[PDB]
Design an enzyme around this catalytic site. Structure first.
Site, PDB file in Angstrom:
ATOM      1  N   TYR B 508      84.186  72.792 -50.172  1.00  0.00           N
ATOM      2  CA  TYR B 508      83.038  72.488 -49.151  1.00  0.00           C
ATOM      3  C   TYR B 508      83.556  70.933 -50.250  1.00  0.00           C
ATOM      4  CZ  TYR B 508      80.703  70.664 -45.872  1.00  0.00           C
ATOM      5  OH  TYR B 508      79.391  69.102 -45.139  1.00  0.00           O
ATOM      6  N   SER B 591      85.010  72.076 -42.263  1.00  0.00           N
ATOM      7  CA  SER B 591      84.763  70.676 -41.872  1.00  0.00           C
ATOM      8  C   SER B 591      84.999  69.629 -43.036  1.00  0.00           C
ATOM      9  CB  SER B 591      83.206  70.372 -41.577  1.00  0.00           C
ATOM     10  OG  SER B 591      82.501  69.377 -41.701  1.00  0.00           O
ATOM     11  N   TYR B 592      84.503  69.453 -43.800  1.00  0.00           N
ATOM     12  CA  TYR B 592      84.377  68.287 -45.043  1.00  0.00           C
ATOM     13  C   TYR B 592      85.625  69.016 -45.550  1.00  0.00           C
ATOM     14  CZ  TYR B 592      84.202  64.825 -48.876  1.00  0.00           C
ATOM     15  OH  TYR B 592      84.615  64.172 -49.221  1.00  0.00           O
ATOM     16  N   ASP B 669      84.721  70.236 -29.435  1.00  0.00           N
ATOM     17  CA  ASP B 669      83.996  69.346 -31.088  1.00  0.00           C
ATOM     18  C   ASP B 669      83.370  68.549 -30.644  1.00  0.00           C
ATOM     19  OD1 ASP B 669      84.336  70.734 -34.990  1.00  0.00           O
ATOM     20  OD2 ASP B 669      83.337  69.087 -33.639  1.00  0.00           O
ATOM     21  N   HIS B 701      82.240  71.938 -33.028  1.00  0.00           N
ATOM     22  CA  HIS B 701      82.391  72.743 -34.533  1.00  0.00           C
ATOM     23  C   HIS B 701      82.151  73.662 -35.137  1.00  0.00           C
ATOM     24  CE1 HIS B 701      83.233  69.876 -38.228  1.00  0.00           C
ATOM     25  NE2 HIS B 701      82.694  70.733 -38.667  1.00  0.00           N
TER      26      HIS B 701
HETATM   27  C1  LIG Z   1      82.933  66.102 -42.240  1.00  0.00           C
HETATM   28  C2  LIG Z   1      81.661  66.113 -41.920  1.00  0.00           C
HETATM   29  C3  LIG Z   1      80.964  67.138 -41.351  1.00  0.00           C
HETATM   30  C4  LIG Z   1      79.907  68.318 -40.627  1.00  0.00           C
HETATM   31  C5  LIG Z   1      79.266  67.806 -41.753  1.00  0.00           C
HETATM   32  C6  LIG Z   1      78.068  68.427 -41.575  1.00  0.00           C
HETATM   33  C7  LIG Z   1      76.323  67.659 -41.934  1.00  0.00           C
HETATM   34  C8  LIG Z   1      77.220  65.684 -41.836  1.00  0.00           C
HETATM   35  N1  LIG Z   1      76.878  65.986 -40.673  1.00  0.00           N
HETATM   36  C9  LIG Z   1      75.126  67.999 -41.692  1.00  0.00           C
HETATM   37  C10 LIG Z   1      73.802  67.375 -41.712  1.00  0.00           C
HETATM   38  C11 LIG Z   1      73.443  66.844 -43.372  1.00  0.00           C
HETATM   39  C12 LIG Z   1      72.204  66.442 -43.359  1.00  0.00           C
HETATM   40  C13 LIG Z   1      73.991  68.121 -44.498  1.00  0.00           C
HETATM   41  N2  LIG Z   1      74.801  69.627 -41.654  1.00  0.00           N
HETATM   42  C14 LIG Z   1      76.287  70.024 -42.098  1.00  0.00           C
HETATM   43  C15 LIG Z   1      75.944  71.145 -41.910  1.00  0.00           C
HETATM   44  C16 LIG Z   1      77.600  69.589 -42.165  1.00  0.00           C
HETATM   45  C17 LIG Z   1      78.565  70.721 -41.914  1.00  0.00           C
HETATM   46  O1  LIG Z   1      78.671  71.181 -40.806  1.00  0.00           O
HETATM   47  O2  LIG Z   1      79.511  70.567 -43.409  1.00  0.00           O
HETATM   48  C18 LIG Z   1      79.796  66.719 -42.373  1.00  0.00           C
HETATM   49  C19 LIG Z   1      80.909  66.291 -43.151  1.00  0.00           C
END
Ligand SMILES: Cc1ccc(-c2c(CN)c(CC(C)C)nc(C)c2C(=O)O)cc1
Ligand SMILES: *[C@@H]1O[C@H](CO)[C@@H](O[C@@H]2O[C@H](CO)[C@@H](O)[C@H](O)[C@H]2NC(C)=O)[C@H](O)[C@H]1NC(C)=O
Ligand SMILES: *[C@@H]1O[C@H](CO)[C@@H](O[C@@H]2O[C@H](CO)[C@@H](O)[C@H](O)[C@H]2NC(C)=O)[C@H](O)[C@H]1NC(C)=O
Ligand SMILES: Cc1ccc(-c2c(CN)c(CC(C)C)nc(C)c2C(=O)O)cc1
Ligand SMILES: *[C@@H]1O[C@H](CO)[C@@H](O)[C@H](O)[C@H]1NC(C)=O
Ligand SMILES: *[C@@H]1O[C@H](CO)[C@@H](O)[C@H](O)[C@H]1NC(C)=O
Ligand SMILES: *[C@@H]1O[C@H](CO)[C@@H](O)[C@H](O)[C@H]1NC(C)=O
Ligand SMILES: *[C@@H]1O[C@H](CO)[C@@H](O)[C@H](O)[C@H]1NC(C)=O
Lengths: 727, 727
Positions: B508, B591-592, B669, B701
């Site tokens: 991740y 995702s990331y 998505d 997503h």
């Molecule tokens: C490119 C991307 C896409 C999504 C996220 C993500 C985020 C941020 N949008 C958050 C909100 C945070 C408060 C943790 N949760 C999660 C579970 C995810 C994830 O699905 O991994 C981070 C980067």
């Protein structure tokens, strides 16, 4: 000693030389040599240069196409080409005077012009811009403004909309001049209630937010465009009054419901013929409309109407065929299916209700190519009873039983596919031959039908193809309930009948299609046979064209049935010949071919290991109204909803567990929408079948981009090679 | 003899039991034993009946969720659940008089309601419908409409817009009751000039034309939503005169332009705390606001302001930390980055700005969990210096040196990762232990820290896992450049290190992430180790959290650099350990993690043979402003454009010729747009690299549909087995 490789195909190593000429008189045509464009004299041939290319190199912009005026005074240049759909495009245009020797700068043709055309004689111009029609009686003059009602995506004047472009006219243009270029006939289409197809275009990586493209597109059963017809006189245009077009209304029996305008053809300076088609495309009417000087109107008499209909299916191959009037405009020839269901040239009198046929038999006339006063020229598959061959015939008008074949015997081994291009009065003709051997371009006189010279015989290609291991084409038939059905095989080099080869089935199989012919091709199949030792075959079963209505109309109202069953049966016939590996048989196709492929793979036949479907249809409610309804009728409880429902690939999802399936589609497909594949994928996921997919960002129905084209064939090659355990 | 298979994972053969409880008071709680609801006690020990499924059987609808009024006189039933984004959804609601179990028949709450909540005491109801806020003082009385400006996809009263939902509040509600239920604080969002992301939605195959979904969504740099904060007095709500909401504005230093509301926290009945974050997220402000009784107004003093800033990165983990207030309201504790990077608890005087740290050292406090007048309870990763462990610490407020670990020594070997749930006045607490052993749930008296009873111990699951060859879990660290970097490994059963195992790197690597911890899981990785004998590995490199700002801020303004490098170096280090097959190392992430996998595959390092990217970011300009800007800054010539352009996966296309790539993305998505992957495939097409692809029609997503979830994991299994030549 080496083969025709994928890189050979994709990179275009072994190039196929053409010979493109544009006739401009009875005696002469234009053609390119060193990019310097020339003119040839058909009689002798003192072919002096016309337009040296040391003219438009530092003119400022890239040349794309050009157009010489009929009278020969003004070359119309074309640049800023920006493609729209299959035929439509937009572009910038500038004119160049030959007699003044220079290019015009005032009253210039707008950027973003939708279509341009010269009058048939002289130098008048007509062009559509911003959906409206304009006319220039002289290139350096300001244009007259024919229409004021054009509106982006709603009112089209002198250009067709999406569905009239792809399906009815096969052209963006919708202007037709009279012979002496006096009258200008145009059609106006109204898309007001035609619902829009929407999809994303991602564009360059620099575009942050994706663009949603929206196109008026009538899916099967939807509200269709309506259509009106007009004629304006160009010799009496004023600047102090709005020019007033005369409407010719469709005949009564067309106005009673939905209908299309399907043909426009001038017969004389003051007579025009329109063909209309009902929305249920088994009934169509031809109207002959005459100009009346003492009112300025047009009169389509009730008694001059001709009706062409079908009880077994639709009318025409794709639409009704086009008339070919005699000089005096009192009679015409056109191809119609006869009592026996075979398509033939019928001779009509404007006044009589009935025509006399002047060809007959168990073969068909493909097209009327030229009509003089002494002879009718047409193309047919009569020779040797090969529905997949083409030849030129001439009919003696004074005794139509006296027919001659112009092309049959010219080069029997090399040449069985021909097409022709006649000089302005048919005193000369260019013969084009597309196989089975290397293509061959030849020139001929009409007087004796004597061969004058070889234009291009591709000896260049021949001389370097000799040391490549080439596949052979075999073309034959099999039988089925006392009917012949034809196929071709691309056989690998040194083909051995005692080896079991793996087999790819190249399917299209839409109504009136023909995959089994004598055309020579250097394509993907050539690679698979030459390099991979894979027999790629194609087969024309029920629904196929050029063999009569009995076969062609067999899938009427029943798409996704006989044409599918017949591909499967063809495979069983190919295994039964014993040179085919039962364990390695595949199927692929594009467009309608993608649908048949998908239906065969979901059939549960057990014949096919794997397949590939490129931009397939998934259910007919998703495809356009004009094509779909032609063969399927309406998708309503009163017409044919049940079979619409029974003929989807989605409903066969569970049986995809029995094959390896590769589904490919472009995202910017305006024609068969990506939707169709989205619904396939979703249905397969829901029944838990595994498969491979590939989308092509921003590509359209032909996935024609250079890089996209290479990528896809490379992907399909890998999929097939691994499907057949090829190393 | 048997292993944890792919079906075991997909069909949940071995379930983890939970003891999800919810406290109704300080003595009792609720539990779903069977599916009938029971009340429980810890005081004397006993536990009686309270509700069942046949209290609301003849109801008709199946209850998605319920909610008891704090007083226990009313129950709110939630049905007709329709999910929207990650937290947002819509639903229908019914209230019963919990005393009589009869439905409140009139003045019912409307369908399609977007959020609903009880006051913290009594039985007041606040709900949002059509983006406007409503209050029901007594469940059978008519509502009072608070706002009149709610407009779809434009103004949101009491609920968040897309980006406040995903990124700021992690919630749909933007409503906050005061402790005694007099005041309802709320936020209003304005997305007027915020651009729409648009994409196709295909729906059931009945949908003839696809639908285009349009969501306000600010990508990096775009115009953001603006915000306003209000409080209204829910006691003096009249019926003849519209409610008046008092506005609390942002401090001056925020209004200079572009800022966010990121925390809302009440202190007393008449004191509320707000936190504002500049759009450049390295400067945040906290305002404390007192209700002025002889005014009806809210006053926030400039002296009372405190400022959280960061010279080395952004402020917070993902946001400024929430403050916990002592009963008087004149004092609060909140976790901040300490003098040397580590995050610890600071003690605040409301009036003066010099806070003082109550904890210190090379570890981080994760969250402040409970506050009494006696002690303060919090969770942290201090125990054995393990960033990936969690335990419950209790600190004596009178003497900060006297700290006690309440969870550390309880079950050392089984239990190194605890979370806690306190009763309404902290006399009792539940401990969740999530691993490394089987999860264990245990109830305690806090008054004497004695363990009362084992609630759920997963001895059922323990029982069957002895019939299964289960994978082991190694947690350890490696020293890079004199720094401790943690990793975890899922190792096949019977792991022997004289063998060379294929290794999948599970990644991740996002800012403040942690993939290396003590949590027990049953997932795809469990199957790969158990059945396919694959090692699954994760690694927390620079940019990961919970180890000090030094490590976490290490990639500030520099996404796609050190977290990409460090994953490559992780593999090297694992191969250097001598039990990995160098020719068979794969990389995958979602995702990331998709973005990083892709950058790693694009890096040309030659370590990885193949890899899977699922819904990856392709370039940071495409992703939402709030998340992206925090780490990247603005993509403008004068800020950080250069790096935006230097950090795209598209630019690295050429290097994918060295690897097998599988790119997967859901077409619906809303979060990471299909675009991002469309740009990936187009880049790869344009350089001519073959790769596998898969879209998922109408998945977001999560690709969280039952059938799709099964389909993707099956598809990815095939890809990895094949890449690894597993039979
Ligand atoms: C490119 C991307 C896409 C999504 C996220 C993500 C985020 C941020 N949008 C958050 C909100 C945070 C408060 C943790 N949760 C999660 C579970 C995810 C994830 O699905 O991994 C981070 C980067
Ligand atoms: C295009 O066709 C539409 C009908 O689909 C025409 O719009 C109608 O115009 C008439 C004028 O009498 C109005 O009464 C209707 O309300 C209109 N219908 C709709 C649905 O808009 C329009 O006349 C046509 N346009 C042109 C210029 O021919
Ligand atoms: C939401 O913000 C927009 C501006 O982004 C406001 O729209 C302006 O409102 C004023 C006052 O009515 C108009 O005169 C302007 O022309 C509007 N500008 C635009 C761009 O629309 C809108 O008023 C705001 N709504 C709320 C409730 O805060
Ligand atoms: C489902 C589907 C999609 C497209 C077509 C098609 C059509 C008809 N739209 C036409 C226009 C005809 C007038 C030839 N040409 C071609 C080459 C194609 C084709 O690409 O095969 C037929 C069916
Ligand atoms: C068309 O475009 C060119 C270049 O943009 C410009 O010079 C010319 O004047 C334009 N012509 C008209 C009539 O719009
Ligand atoms: C032609 O018709 C249009 C639209 O009805 C009108 O606006 C215009 O004045 C007319 N043109 C002239 C110059 O007569
Ligand atoms: C919600 O909608 C349904 C269906 O239209 C209706 O019958 C029902 O009465 C509605 N309930 C409420 C709470 O208004
Ligand atoms: C409250 O204000 C709204 C909107 O500004 C207005 O439409 C309405 O008349 C008022 N409502 C009542 C019940 O007085």
């Amino acid at each position: 000693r080496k083969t025709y490789t994928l890189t050979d195909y994709l990179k275009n190593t072994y190039r196929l030389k053409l010979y493109s000429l544009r006739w401009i008189s009875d005696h002469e045509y234009l053609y390119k040599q060193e990019n310097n464009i020339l003119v040839f004299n058909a009689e002798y041939g003192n072919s002096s240069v016309f337009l040296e290319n040391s003219t438009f190199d530092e003119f400022g912009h890239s040349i794309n196409d050009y157009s010489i005026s009929p009278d020969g005074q003004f070359i119309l240049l074309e640049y800023n080409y920006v493609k729209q759909w299959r035929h439509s495009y937009t572009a910038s245009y500038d004119i160049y005077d030959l007699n003044k020797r220079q290019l015009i700068t005032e009253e210039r043709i707008p950027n973003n012009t939708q279509w341009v055309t010269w009058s048939p004689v002289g130098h008048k111009l007509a062009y559509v811009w911003n959906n409206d029609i304009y006319v220039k009686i002289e290139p350096n003059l300001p244009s007259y403004r024919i229409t004021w009602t054009g509106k982006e995506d709603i009112i089209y004047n002198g250009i067709t909309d999406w569905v009239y472009e792809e399906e009815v006219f096969s052209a963006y243009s919708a202007l037709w001049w009279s012979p002496n270029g006096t009258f200008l006939a145009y059609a106006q289409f109204n898309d007001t209630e035609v619902p829009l197809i929407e999809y994303s275009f991602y564009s360059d990586e620099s575009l942050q937010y994706p663009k949603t493209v929206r196109v008026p597109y009538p899916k099967a059963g939807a509200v269709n465009p309506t259509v009106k017809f007009f004629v304006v006189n160009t010799d009496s245009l004023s600047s102090v009054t709005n020019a007033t077009s005369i409407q010719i209304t469709a005949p009564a029996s067309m106005l009673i419901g939905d209908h299309y305008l399907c043909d426009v053809t001038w017969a004389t300076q003051e007579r025009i013929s329109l063909q209309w088609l009902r929305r249920i495309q088994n009934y169509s009417v031809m109207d002959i409309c005459d100009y009346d000087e003492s009112s300025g109107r047009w009169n389509c008499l009730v008694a001059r109407q001709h009706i062409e209909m079908s009880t077994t299916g639709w009318v025409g191959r794709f639409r009704p065929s086009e008339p070919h009037f005699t000089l005096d405009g009192n009679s015409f020839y056109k191809i119609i299916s006869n009592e026996e269901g075979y398509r033939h040239i019928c001779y009509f009198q404007i006044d009589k209700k009935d025509c006399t046929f002047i060809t007959k038999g168990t073969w068909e006339v493909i097209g009327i190519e030229a009509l003089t006063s002494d002879y009718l020229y047409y193309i047919s598959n009569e020779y040797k009873g090969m529905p997949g061959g083409r030849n030129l015939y001439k009919i003696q008008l004074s005794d139509y039983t006296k027919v001659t074949c112009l092309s049959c015997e010219l080069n029997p081994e090399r040449c069985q596919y021909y097409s022709v291009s006649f000089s302005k009065e048919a005193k000369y003709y260019q013969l084009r031959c597309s196989g089975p051997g290397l293509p061959l371009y030849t020139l001929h006189s009409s007087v004796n039908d004597k061969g004058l010279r070889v234009l291009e015989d591709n000896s260049a290609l021949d001389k370097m193809l000799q040391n490549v291991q080439m596949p052979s084409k075999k073309l034959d038939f099999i039988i089925l309930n006392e009917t012949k059905f034809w196929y071709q095989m691309i056989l690998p080099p040194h083909f051995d009948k005692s080896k079991k080869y793996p087999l790819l089935l190249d399917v299209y199989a839409g109504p009136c299609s023909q995959k089994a012919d004598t055309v020579f091709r250097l394509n993907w199949a050539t690679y698979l046979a030459s390099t991979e030792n894979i027999i790629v075959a194609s087969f024309d079963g029920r629904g196929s064209g050029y063999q009569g209505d009995k076969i062609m109309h067999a899938i009427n109202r029943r798409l996704g049935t006989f044409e599918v069953e017949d591909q499967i049966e063809a495979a069983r016939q190919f295994s039964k010949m014993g040179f085919v590996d039962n364990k390695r048989i595949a199927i692929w196709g594009w467009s309608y071919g993608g649908y048949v492929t998908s239906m065969v793979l979901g059939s549960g036949s057990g014949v096919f290991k794997c397949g590939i479907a490129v931009a397939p249809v998934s259910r007919w409610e998703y495809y356009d109204s004009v094509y779909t309804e032609r063969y399927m009728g309406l998708p309503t409880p009163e017409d044919n909803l049940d079979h619409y429902r029974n003929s989807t690939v989605m409903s066969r999802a569970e049986n995809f567990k029995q094959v390896e399936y590769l589904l490919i589609h472009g995202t910017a497909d305006d024609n068969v929408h990506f939707q169709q594949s989205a619904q396939i994928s979703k249905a397969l996921v829901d029944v838990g079948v595994d498969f491979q997919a590939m989308w092509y960002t921003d590509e359209d129905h032909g996935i024609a981009s250079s890089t996209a084209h290479q990528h896809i064939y490379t992907h399909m090659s890998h999929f097939i090679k691994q499907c057949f355990s090829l190393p």
